[PDB]
Structure formats: C-alpha cells, structure tokens
Design a protein around this ligand. Structure first.
Ligand SMILES: OC[C@H]1O[C@@H](S[C@@H]2O[C@H](CO)[C@H](O)[C@H](n3cc(-c4ccsc4)nn3)[C@H]2O)[C@H](O)[C@@H](n2cc(-c3ccsc3)nn2)[C@H]1O
Ligand SMILES: [Cl-]
Length: 137
C-alpha cells in the first residue's frame, strides 16, 4: 500500500472493533504515526519515535482545534528498524487498547467522546505498509 494511507472507518468506531495494521519498519526509521481522525481533530495520535534525544519512545496525544493536548508517553518500545510488525488497535468502551506483535502495549482513555464521528485512520511515517483492515470481534 502507498504511504501515507487513509483507511475510512464507516460510521466511526465502536467497542469490539479491531483494527489490524501489518507492515515493516524501514531501515533507519525515524517515526511512525497512526492518526484516528474526527474531521480535522485527531482523537488518538499514536507516534513511535526512534530517536528523540537518542531514546526510543512512544508518544500518544489528541489534537483539538489544531492544538495538541497533554502527551502520554510509553518507554516500552516493541518496534525495531528493518523488521515486520503487527499493530492491533481494539476499541473498548473507555479506551483504545494497543497490542504490538501480540503483546499488550498500552491503553489510551477516550478524550474525544463522539466515537461514531472518528471516521478516518491515517497511517504515515517510515514504514512499508502491507495491510490495513478492520473486523468486529
Ligand atoms: O504531542 C504530539 C505531537 O508532538 C509534536 S513534537 C512536540 O513539540 C512540543 C513543542 O511544540 C514539545 O517539545 C513536545 N514534548 C513533550 C516532551 C515531554 C513530555 C514529557 S517529558 C518530555 N518533550 N517534547 C514534543 O513532543 C509533533 O511534531 C507532532 N507530530 C508528529 C507528526 C508526524 C507526522 C508524520 S510521522 C509523525 N505530525 N505532528 C505530534 O507528535
Ligand atoms: Cl467529543
């Protein structure tokens, strides 16, 4: 698939919706981003950073009216440059639940409350993208 990639989420997200992204991190990657969007707002920005002051960190945030909110940071970093990955995002009633390569990574409490209006997923950054899909579990 071409990156950046836009995956429509028809009628928004709902609990029990599982989104699966398969790809490979490019060699010498710098960043990856998944952006769950409600129009121009970003309900959930998931942003692995491969070199922030020589550390690897995952940053999560929400953008409302073009302004970023309080960052939530995770030091557990399951991505490796050059290697294939699977990201699964499970929508639960109170949070997005993220697993990478079948291991739980983090939860992100819903800041944007109108789940039915979060109708696009943007995928960008330093990856080769193989597949992006969703199903109900
Ligand atoms: O909050 C998320 C946003 O962060 C900003 S960078 C942000 O800048 C601030 C000053 O304006 C602070 O410096 C902030 N900070 C917070 C901390 C901190 C927090 C706790 S200890 C240290 N140390 N830096 C730092 O993260 C990125 O630019 C945004 N971004 C990424 C992308 C993208 C596109 C394609 S792939 C990625 N498109 N927009 C997005 O990730
Ligand atoms: Cl809302």
């Amino acid at each position: 698939l071409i990156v950046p990639y836009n995956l429509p989420l028809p009628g928004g997200v709902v609990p029990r919706m599982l989104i699966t992204i398969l790809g490979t991190v490019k060699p010498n990657a710098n960043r990856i981003a998944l952006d769950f969007q409600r129009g121009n707002d970003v309900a959930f920005h998931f942003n692995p950073r491969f070199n922030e002051n020589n550390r690897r960190v995952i940053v999560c945030n929400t953008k409302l009216d073009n302004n970023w909110g309080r960052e939530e940071r995770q030091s557990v970093f399951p991505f490796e440059s050059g290697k294939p990955f699977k990201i699964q995002v499970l929508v639960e009633p109170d949070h997005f639940k993220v697993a990478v390569n079948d291991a739980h990574l983090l939860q992100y409490n819903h800041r944007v409350k109108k789940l039915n209006e979060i109708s696009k997923l943007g995928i960008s950054g330093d990856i080769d993208l193989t597949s992006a899909s969703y199903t109900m579990i």
